[PDB]
Enzyme design. Structure first.
Site, PDB file in Angstrom:
ATOM      1  N   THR A 159       0.476  -0.864  -0.030  1.00 21.49           N
ATOM      2  CA  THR A 159       0.177  -0.181  -0.151  1.00 21.49           C
ATOM      3  C   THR A 159       0.874   1.109  -0.111  1.00 21.49           C
ATOM      4  OG1 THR A 159      -1.479  -1.111   0.889  1.00 21.49           O
ATOM      5  CG2 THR A 159      -1.704   1.251   0.228  1.00 21.49           C
ATOM      6  N   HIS A 265      -8.431  -9.366   2.327  1.00 17.57           N
ATOM      7  CA  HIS A 265      -7.558  -9.595   3.255  1.00 17.57           C
ATOM      8  C   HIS A 265      -8.812 -10.905   3.927  1.00 17.57           C
ATOM      9  CE1 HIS A 265      -3.486  -8.351   2.635  1.00 17.57           C
ATOM     10  NE2 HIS A 265      -4.493  -6.993   3.016  1.00 17.57           N
ATOM     11  N   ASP A 687      22.442   1.578  -9.201  1.00 17.95           N
ATOM     12  CA  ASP A 687      21.376   2.855  -9.115  1.00 17.95           C
ATOM     13  C   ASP A 687      20.706   2.623  -9.773  1.00 17.95           C
ATOM     14  OD1 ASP A 687      22.834   3.771 -10.976  1.00 17.95           O
ATOM     15  OD2 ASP A 687      23.848   5.662  -9.521  1.00 17.95           O
ATOM     16  N   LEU A 689      21.936   3.550 -12.611  1.00 20.12           N
ATOM     17  CA  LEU A 689      21.733   4.517 -13.817  1.00 20.12           C
ATOM     18  C   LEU A 689      23.158   4.159 -14.952  1.00 20.12           C
ATOM     19  CD1 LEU A 689      21.209   8.073 -11.820  1.00 20.12           C
ATOM     20  CD2 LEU A 689      20.183   6.199 -13.489  1.00 20.12           C
TER      21      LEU A 689
HETATM   22  C1  LIG Z   1      14.404   8.000 -10.892  1.00 23.84           C
HETATM   23  O1  LIG Z   1      14.226   9.548 -10.468  1.00 23.84           O
HETATM   24  C2  LIG Z   1      15.263  10.225  -9.391  1.00 23.84           C
HETATM   25  C3  LIG Z   1      14.563  11.854  -9.458  1.00 23.84           C
HETATM   26  O2  LIG Z   1      15.175  12.391 -10.214  1.00 23.84           O
HETATM   27  C4  LIG Z   1      16.594  10.056  -9.972  1.00 23.84           C
HETATM   28  O3  LIG Z   1      16.832  10.294  -8.504  1.00 23.84           O
HETATM   29  C5  LIG Z   1      17.295  11.276  -8.601  1.00 23.84           C
HETATM   30  O4  LIG Z   1      19.463  10.966  -8.859  1.00 23.84           O
HETATM   31  C6  LIG Z   1      20.269  12.415  -9.058  1.00 23.84           C
HETATM   32  C7  LIG Z   1      21.370  11.381  -9.186  1.00 23.84           C
HETATM   33  O5  LIG Z   1      21.735   9.996  -9.268  1.00 23.84           O
HETATM   34  C8  LIG Z   1      20.316  12.763  -6.938  1.00 23.84           C
HETATM   35  O6  LIG Z   1      21.107  13.762  -7.345  1.00 23.84           O
HETATM   36  C9  LIG Z   1      22.247  13.801  -6.448  1.00 23.84           C
HETATM   37  O7  LIG Z   1      21.309  14.745  -5.376  1.00 23.84           O
HETATM   38  C10 LIG Z   1      22.352  15.254  -4.069  1.00 23.84           C
HETATM   39  C11 LIG Z   1      20.972  16.118  -3.277  1.00 23.84           C
HETATM   40  O8  LIG Z   1      21.030  15.416  -2.481  1.00 23.84           O
HETATM   41  C12 LIG Z   1      18.789  15.714  -1.787  1.00 23.84           C
HETATM   42  O9  LIG Z   1      18.814  16.588  -2.931  1.00 23.84           O
HETATM   43  C13 LIG Z   1      17.578  16.470  -4.067  1.00 23.84           C
HETATM   44  C14 LIG Z   1      16.865  17.952  -4.467  1.00 23.84           C
HETATM   45  O10 LIG Z   1      15.286  18.273  -3.524  1.00 23.84           O
HETATM   46  C15 LIG Z   1      16.640  15.039  -3.016  1.00 23.84           C
HETATM   47  O11 LIG Z   1      15.523  15.054  -4.027  1.00 23.84           O
HETATM   48  C16 LIG Z   1      17.682  14.072  -2.687  1.00 23.84           C
HETATM   49  O12 LIG Z   1      16.922  13.428  -1.980  1.00 23.84           O
HETATM   50  C17 LIG Z   1      17.561  12.104  -1.510  1.00 23.84           C
HETATM   51  O13 LIG Z   1      17.701  12.830  -0.426  1.00 23.84           O
HETATM   52  C18 LIG Z   1      17.277  11.499   0.847  1.00 23.84           C
HETATM   53  C19 LIG Z   1      18.278  10.752   0.516  1.00 23.84           C
HETATM   54  O14 LIG Z   1      18.850  10.424   2.077  1.00 23.84           O
HETATM   55  C20 LIG Z   1      16.167  11.317   0.783  1.00 23.84           C
HETATM   56  O15 LIG Z   1      14.807  11.761   1.122  1.00 23.84           O
HETATM   57  C21 LIG Z   1      15.360  11.161  -0.746  1.00 23.84           C
HETATM   58  O16 LIG Z   1      13.889  10.037  -0.811  1.00 23.84           O
HETATM   59  C22 LIG Z   1      16.549  10.839  -1.539  1.00 23.84           C
HETATM   60  O17 LIG Z   1      17.004   9.427  -1.271  1.00 23.84           O
HETATM   61  C23 LIG Z   1      17.142   8.872  -2.635  1.00 23.84           C
HETATM   62  O18 LIG Z   1      18.249   9.427  -3.649  1.00 23.84           O
HETATM   63  C24 LIG Z   1      19.980   9.390  -2.897  1.00 23.84           C
HETATM   64  C25 LIG Z   1      20.655  10.143  -3.731  1.00 23.84           C
HETATM   65  O19 LIG Z   1      20.086  11.670  -3.419  1.00 23.84           O
HETATM   66  C26 LIG Z   1      19.625   8.002  -2.393  1.00 23.84           C
HETATM   67  O20 LIG Z   1      21.173   7.391  -1.946  1.00 23.84           O
HETATM   68  C27 LIG Z   1      18.549   6.916  -1.733  1.00 23.84           C
HETATM   69  O21 LIG Z   1      19.178   5.756  -1.620  1.00 23.84           O
HETATM   70  C28 LIG Z   1      17.746   7.582  -2.111  1.00 23.84           C
HETATM   71  O22 LIG Z   1      17.423   6.173  -3.099  1.00 23.84           O
HETATM   72  C29 LIG Z   1      18.671  15.046  -1.458  1.00 23.84           C
HETATM   73  O23 LIG Z   1      17.665  15.147  -0.346  1.00 23.84           O
HETATM   74  C30 LIG Z   1      23.586  15.860  -5.005  1.00 23.84           C
HETATM   75  O24 LIG Z   1      24.797  15.543  -3.462  1.00 23.84           O
HETATM   76  C31 LIG Z   1      23.825  14.040  -5.551  1.00 23.84           C
HETATM   77  O25 LIG Z   1      25.922  15.601  -5.798  1.00 23.84           O
HETATM   78  C32 LIG Z   1      26.736  14.404  -6.204  1.00 23.84           C
HETATM   79  O26 LIG Z   1      27.257  13.769  -8.017  1.00 23.84           O
HETATM   80  C33 LIG Z   1      27.531  14.372  -8.165  1.00 23.84           C
HETATM   81  C34 LIG Z   1      27.513  12.988  -9.251  1.00 23.84           C
HETATM   82  O27 LIG Z   1      27.073  13.718 -10.705  1.00 23.84           O
HETATM   83  C35 LIG Z   1      28.665  14.764  -8.609  1.00 23.84           C
HETATM   84  O28 LIG Z   1      28.585  16.398  -9.669  1.00 23.84           O
HETATM   85  C36 LIG Z   1      28.977  15.369  -7.480  1.00 23.84           C
HETATM   86  O29 LIG Z   1      29.966  16.396  -6.929  1.00 23.84           O
HETATM   87  C37 LIG Z   1      28.165  15.958  -5.606  1.00 23.84           C
HETATM   88  O30 LIG Z   1      29.540  14.381  -5.099  1.00 23.84           O
HETATM   89  C38 LIG Z   1      29.648  15.471  -4.196  1.00 23.84           C
HETATM   90  O31 LIG Z   1      29.029  14.421  -3.792  1.00 23.84           O
HETATM   91  C39 LIG Z   1      29.074  12.383  -3.730  1.00 23.84           C
HETATM   92  C40 LIG Z   1      27.982  11.471  -3.240  1.00 23.84           C
HETATM   93  O32 LIG Z   1      27.718  11.843  -2.174  1.00 23.84           O
HETATM   94  C41 LIG Z   1      30.597  12.549  -2.927  1.00 23.84           C
HETATM   95  O33 LIG Z   1      30.845  10.929  -2.994  1.00 23.84           O
HETATM   96  C42 LIG Z   1      31.344  13.679  -3.778  1.00 23.84           C
HETATM   97  O34 LIG Z   1      32.753  13.226  -3.623  1.00 23.84           O
HETATM   98  C43 LIG Z   1      30.822  14.832  -3.514  1.00 23.84           C
HETATM   99  O35 LIG Z   1      30.549  15.738  -2.000  1.00 23.84           O
HETATM  100  C44 LIG Z   1      23.613  13.900  -6.722  1.00 23.84           C
HETATM  101  O36 LIG Z   1      22.732  14.810  -8.143  1.00 23.84           O
HETATM  102  C45 LIG Z   1      18.909  12.871  -7.069  1.00 23.84           C
HETATM  103  O37 LIG Z   1      19.012  13.894  -5.685  1.00 23.84           O
HETATM  104  C46 LIG Z   1      17.803  11.858  -7.091  1.00 23.84           C
HETATM  105  N1  LIG Z   1      16.421  11.918  -6.962  1.00 23.84           N
HETATM  106  C47 LIG Z   1      16.108  11.798  -5.606  1.00 23.84           C
HETATM  107  C48 LIG Z   1      14.488  12.262  -5.256  1.00 23.84           C
HETATM  108  O38 LIG Z   1      15.811  10.197  -5.610  1.00 23.84           O
HETATM  109  C49 LIG Z   1      17.403   8.416 -10.079  1.00 23.84           C
HETATM  110  O39 LIG Z   1      17.624   7.976 -10.281  1.00 23.84           O
HETATM  111  C50 LIG Z   1      15.135   7.846 -10.963  1.00 23.84           C
HETATM  112  N2  LIG Z   1      15.659   5.948 -11.181  1.00 23.84           N
HETATM  113  C51 LIG Z   1      16.184   6.176 -13.283  1.00 23.84           C
HETATM  114  C52 LIG Z   1      16.026   4.660 -12.677  1.00 23.84           C
HETATM  115  O40 LIG Z   1      16.520   6.499 -13.389  1.00 23.84           O
HETATM  116 CA   LIG Z   2      -3.473  -1.378   0.216  1.00 27.25          CA
HETATM  117 CA   LIG Z   3      25.193   2.709 -11.503  1.00 28.92          CA
HETATM  118 ZN   LIG Z   4      -3.540  -5.261   2.115  1.00 28.47          ZN
END
Ligand SMILES: *[C@@H]1O[C@H](CO)[C@@H](O[C@@H]2O[C@H](CO)[C@@H](O[C@@H]3O[C@H](CO[C@H]4O[C@H](CO)[C@@H](O)[C@H](O[C@H]5O[C@H](CO)[C@@H](O)[C@H](O)[C@@H]5O[C@H]5O[C@H](CO)[C@@H](O)[C@H](O)[C@@H]5O)[C@@H]4O)[C@@H](O)[C@H](O[C@H]4O[C@H](CO)[C@@H](O)[C@H](O)[C@@H]4O[C@H]4O[C@H](CO)[C@@H](O)[C@H](O)[C@@H]4O)[C@@H]3O)[C@H](O)[C@H]2NC(C)=O)[C@H](O)[C@H]1NC(C)=O
Ligand SMILES: [Ca+2]
Ligand SMILES: [Ca+2]
Ligand SMILES: [Zn+2]
Ligand SMILES: Cc1cc(OCC2=NNC(=O)CC2)c(C(C)(C)C)cc1C#N
Ligand code: NA
Ligand code: NA
Length: 805
Positions: A159, A265, A687, A689
């Site tokens: 759900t 259920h 991921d 990607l």
């Molecule tokens: C499906 O669609 C989604 C949405 O478009 C795609 O997900 C996106 O993927 C992007 C690339 O992977 C990702 O971009 C990163 O954003 C970071 C900013 O993070 C915050 O801000 C945003 C914006 O409002 C927010 O949405 C983020 O959301 C996560 O935050 C928490 C996680 O704890 C959760 O509440 C939420 O659910 C979400 O979690 C999910 O995403 C995270 C990663 O963001 C996962 O780890 C979780 O498991 C979960 O799946 C954040 O709150 C930004 O910081 C990143 O930037 C770094 O990386 C780039 C790479 O080029 C680099 O250029 C920069 O240098 C930078 O480097 C620095 O950080 C590195 C990594 O930490 C570090 O190692 C370096 O050495 C540097 O210090 C990055 O751009 C975007 O956040 C997500 N969005 C979401 C919502 O998930 C998804 O890819 C699609 N799927 C498919 C299969 O296509």
């Molecule tokens: Ca349900």
């Molecule tokens: Ca990958």
């Molecule tokens: Zn149910």
């Protein structure tokens, strides 16, 4: 701590949250123990129930009544939904004929058709047909509006994951709600159906619709409905909001029903007790539609009737116990039921070995009703790995079964006859979509689609710009009478090089051998035509894929296949070739068994080498264009180019060889030719990607040759299979897969048998959308066709599921 001493007087179901501790008058007030003292008295009136009766007509207003049959009620916005019918000889909406809504017919002051999302828990796709006789309102929406035969939920088919996917367009791994039950190891906290923990905003990632709407100046009703608020009051509340003044009135609303899941259920999906819950939902829908018609909004509002997941037959006795497989069962925590997730009972324990746990659960009983997986090895179509809340060990449970840790968990928690949460490809888990309103099409059936696509459409329906999400925007344009979104193809980032012959044989020292030397002038113009691209129209039917990131790569033409060869990864990104219905399969001749041939168009320094594979005792090699489907002995030589070679585990070569020797030809025979694009995929951090090269964790020993995590194929043909794949005038048919590149076949319990008994079953499990492969490769396919882009986007989101009907 609240001071619940304030009043709800004139604030019932108020739309802005008021901050502690001045008390609250909204759906969430119950859940937080924060309702004003008079909330029930003022806001949850029940007196006289929910229907006007003739004797109430024109009554003098009594403000205690649940709803009103007084003359002033339409202006006050609070008539019983049946008021006009009882007291003014109007017809029920369901009894009116279906009339096309070509334009929105909205009262003055309505800037845009409102959107109402009517969501129903556990509403299995086949209920549309099997309960059609007791759901007349729902059947009218369905036949008069736009409907799919079913909608595909996300995994797990539970759900909260599916409701939050509806709201965000994101996979659970991205939005964070990866189960109805979760442990977050960083929070050291558990999310459950009961409890207050689930209300903390830290669990909920992404940007749900109501926040997208609010940030862009569009107001929203509540999406969450307290379980104790009856359905009649939820509908009345939505209709009262809709009578608000223009500056205060929301544009997006949701209704939610706990039925039919709740009964399902208890009684199973088609238990005789299920007829009534269906009747009851239909009646709610009737209420909403009679309410809209009273307010003159029934040809103005767009209504989405949508389910979160279906329901399957599941009883206590169809339970697999881990205590039957493991000795050490008191060392783990299992998230049980229709999926399994296993972690260590104690974090203070490097004496926890996932490998031993997996090994103890693999192919241990002949009839085993679950399969264990490291999460990174799950079918990539599930997109269920990239979140710390997903345990490393996962059990995929067979439809109709449960998994539990020990028997005592099942009788010291029989009760239930139905459940859900299985793989989202499973027929019983499929759910419903109908869209009805001015913006949806009239009497239209659309193909089945995934629920991740809806967020974009709902944003379109409200003139919002969607936050970044996992939908493919434009893929559901065909649902809509009028589209505000016009998709266009992403621009090509890297242009290919087209190398000619640049290197002499003796420049190569690749440690490769081949037996290939045997002396005609008119067939050395002809071979040169092939290496120049003369047959490219045959083998590359839909344009070259566009590379959407910065890299260095070469287009290589051959009589039988074309490739895009990466100088960075030292192997094709993609290899394209067409196999006609008539094409013959041949063997690798004896003298060419170990043949690898330097490619004189590509420098030694950008080529693989045979020595590496010789030294790597784990790693072997395969070819992307299969030698077995060579057009002639002479063209066969091209298939042994070093530029066609890719690293493969011997165990994986069993799968790949069978796919290349047997299955390609069969598909060409069944589909009237196929075009095939095959290639490697690198996703070491799971991921979904494309990995950069600094993310690769494994190389062929002592080389720069990266090891793929997966290998893909996209197999395209003409939808009208009376036309051959290479001469197709209309729409296309695709199936694809992403096969895990694994050094063992432990996933397949019959892998000791001939490939004919297990390979194809493996491939079906790893069925994929073209779009999945795009994310994993940074490639963009179907760039040159005769088809509209919207149609192509639909094609790229298609999943071939291999279920019955
Ligand atoms: C499906 O669609 C989604 C949405 O478009 C795609 O997900 C996106 O993927 C992007 C690339 O992977 C990702 O971009 C990163 O954003 C970071 C900013 O993070 C915050 O801000 C945003 C914006 O409002 C927010 O949405 C983020 O959301 C996560 O935050 C928490 C996680 O704890 C959760 O509440 C939420 O659910 C979400 O979690 C999910 O995403 C995270 C990663 O963001 C996962 O780890 C979780 O498991 C979960 O799946 C954040 O709150 C930004 O910081 C990143 O930037 C770094 O990386 C780039 C790479 O080029 C680099 O250029 C920069 O240098 C930078 O480097 C620095 O950080 C590195 C990594 O930490 C570090 O190692 C370096 O050495 C540097 O210090 C990055 O751009 C975007 O956040 C997500 N969005 C979401 C919502 O998930 C998804 O890819 C699609 N799927 C498919 C299969 O296509
Ligand atoms: Ca349900
Ligand atoms: Ca990958
Ligand atoms: Zn149910
Ligand atoms: C239509 C919809 C309803 C929703 O909440 C409904 C609900 N109400 N009451 C409960 O007790 C169970 C869940 C939600 C969530 C994300 C807020 C759960 C999303 C969406 C969407 N899109
Ligand atoms: Na080897
Ligand atoms: Na096996």
């Amino acid at each position: 701590w609240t001071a619940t001493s304030g009043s709800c007087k004139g604030r019932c179901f108020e739309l802005q949250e008021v901050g502690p501790p001045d008390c609250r008058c909204d759906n969430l007030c119950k859940s937080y123990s924060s309702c004003c003292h008079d909330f029930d008295e003022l806001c949850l009136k029940t007196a006289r129930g929910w229907e006007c009766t003739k004797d109430r007509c024109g009554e003098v207003r009594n403000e205690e009544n649940a709803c009103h049959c007084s003359e002033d009620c339409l202006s006050r916005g609070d008539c019983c939904t049946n008021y006009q019918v009882v007291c003014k000889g109007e017809s029920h909406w369901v009894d009116d004929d279906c009339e096309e809504i070509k334009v929105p017919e909205c009262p003055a002051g309505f800037v845009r058709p409102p959107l109402i999302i009517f969501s129903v828990d556990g509403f299995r796709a086949s209920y549309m047909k099997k309960g059609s006789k007791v759901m007349p309102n729902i059947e009218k929406l369905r036949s008069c509006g736009t409907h799919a035969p079913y909608m595909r939920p996300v995994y797990p088919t539970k759900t909260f994951p599916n409701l939050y996917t509806l709201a965000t367009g994101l996979y659970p791994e991205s939005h964070g709600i990866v189960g109805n039950s979760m442990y977050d190891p960083v929070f050291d906290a558990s999310f459950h159906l009961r409890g207050r923990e689930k209300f903390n905003h830290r669990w909920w990632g992404g940007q749900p619709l109501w926040i997208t709407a609010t940030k862009q100046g569009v107001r929203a009703g509540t999406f969450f409905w307290s379980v104790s608020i009856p359905h009649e009051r939820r509908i009345l509340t939505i209709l009262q909001w809709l009578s608000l003044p223009d500056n205060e009135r929301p544009s997006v609303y949701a209704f939610y029903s706990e039925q039919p899941d709740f009964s399902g259920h208890k009684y199973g999906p088609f238990g005789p007790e299920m007829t009534n819950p269906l009747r009851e939902i239909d009646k709610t829908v009737g209420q909403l539609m009679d309410g809209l018609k009273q307010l003159r909004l029934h040809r103005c509002v767009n209504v989405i009737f949508v389910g979160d997941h279906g329901m399957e037959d599941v009883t206590c006795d169809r339970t697999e116990f881990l205590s039957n497989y493991l000795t050490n069962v008191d060392d783990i925590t299992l998230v049980p039921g229709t999926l399994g997730r296993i972690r260590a009972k104690s974090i203070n324990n490097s004496k926890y070995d996932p490998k031993t746990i997996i090994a103890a659960l693999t192919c241990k009983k002949p009839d085993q009703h679950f399969k264990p997986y490291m999460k990174q090895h799950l079918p990539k179509r599930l997109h269920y790995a990239n979140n710390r809340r997903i345990e490393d060990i996962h059990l995929l449970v067979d439809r109709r079964w449960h998994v539990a840790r020990k028997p005592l968990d099942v009788y010291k928690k029989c009760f239930f006859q139905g459940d859900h949460g299985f793989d989202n490809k499973v027929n019983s888990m499929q759910t419903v979509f109908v869209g009805y309103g001015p913006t949806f099409k009239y009497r239209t059936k659309v193909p089945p689609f995934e629920n991740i696509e809806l967020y974009n459409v709902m944003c379109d329906l409200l003139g919002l710009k969607p936050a970044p999400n996992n939908g493919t925007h434009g893929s559901l344009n065909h649902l809509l009478r009028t589209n505000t979104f016009r998709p266009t193809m992403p621009d090509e980032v890297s242009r290919p090089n087209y190398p000619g012959i640049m290197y002499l044989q003796s420049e190569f020292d690749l440690g490769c051998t081949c037996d290939d030397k045997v002396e005609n002038k008119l067939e050395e113009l002809n071979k040169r035509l092939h290496t120049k691209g003369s047959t490219k129209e045959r083998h590359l039917l839909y344009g070259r894929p566009a590379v959407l990131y910065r890299t260095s790569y070469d287009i290589l033409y051959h009589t039988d296949f074309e490739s895009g060869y990466s100088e960075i990864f030292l192997m094709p990104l993609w290899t394209s070739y067409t196999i006609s219905k008539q094409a013959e399969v041949s063997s690798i001749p004896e003298h060419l068994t170990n043949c690898v041939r330097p490619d004189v168009r590509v420098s030694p320094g950008f080529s693989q080498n045979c020595l590496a594979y010789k030294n790597d005792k784990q790693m072997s090699y395969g070819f992307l264009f299969p030698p077995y489907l060579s057009s002639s002995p002479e063209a066969k030589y091209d298939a042994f180019l070093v530029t066609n070679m890719v690293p493969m585990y011997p165990a994986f070569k069993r799968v790949w060889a069978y796919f290349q020797r047997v299955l390609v030809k069969k598909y060409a025979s069944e589909r009237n030719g196929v075009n095939v694009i095959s290639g490697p995929i690198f996703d070491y951090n799971y991921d979904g990607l494309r990995d950069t090269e600094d993310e690769i964790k494994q190389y062929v020993e002592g080389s720069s040759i990266p090891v793929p995590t997966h290998y893909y194929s996209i197999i395209t043909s003409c939808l009208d299979f009376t036309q051959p794949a290479d001469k197709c005038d209309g729409p296309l048919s695709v199936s694809s897969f992403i096969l895990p590149h694994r050094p063992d076949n432990d996933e397949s319990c019959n892998s000791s048998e001939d490939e004919s008994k297990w390979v194809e079953e493996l491939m079906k499990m790893h069925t994929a959308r073209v779009r999945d492969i795009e994310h994993l490769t940074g490639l963009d396919f179907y760039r040159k066709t005769s088809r509209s882009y919207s149609e192509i986007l639909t094609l790229k989101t298609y999943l071939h599921t291999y279920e019955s009907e």
